[PDB]
Design goal:
The protein is built from one helix and eight strands, in the order βββββββαβ. An eight-stranded mixed beta sheet has the order 4-3-2-1-7-6-5-8. It is globular. It is classed as hydrolase.
Length: 108
């Protein structure tokens, strides 16, 4: 449905620090890659059982930040905490939120 680069702010101490990843969004699954060639296949999460929320001032929010969180568990699989995503512009945040909603993600 939508593809682009997104920075993940929540990464564990073993690999901590915000990092930019290539993301592919479809109606069925969310697939994250370290490359735009879509070969790494870092981790995947299903579209459903997820919801979109805003974020608090817990990060140096020089970017436009929104969070996709698991409604069944406390964290995203193969990830640290919930998937807080930072965009270069606010339009990217709104576009991604709309894309996730169309894919099947539900509002908080």
């Amino acid at each position: 449905i939508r593809k682009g680069w997104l920075t993940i702010n929540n990464i564990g101490i073993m690999k901590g620090g915000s990092k930019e990843y290539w993301f592919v969004l479809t109606a069925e699954n969310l697939s994250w890659y370290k490359d735009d060639e879509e070969k790494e296949k870092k981790y995947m999460l299903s579209v459903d059982n997820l919801k979109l929320r805003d974020v608090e001032k817990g990060f140096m929010s020089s970017k436009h930040i929104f969070a996709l969180f698991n409604t069944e568990q406390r964290n995203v699989y193969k990830d640290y905490r919930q998937l807080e995503l930072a965009c270069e512009t606010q339009e990217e945040v709104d576009s991604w939120k709309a894309s996730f909603l169309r894919a099947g993600v539900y509002p908080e």
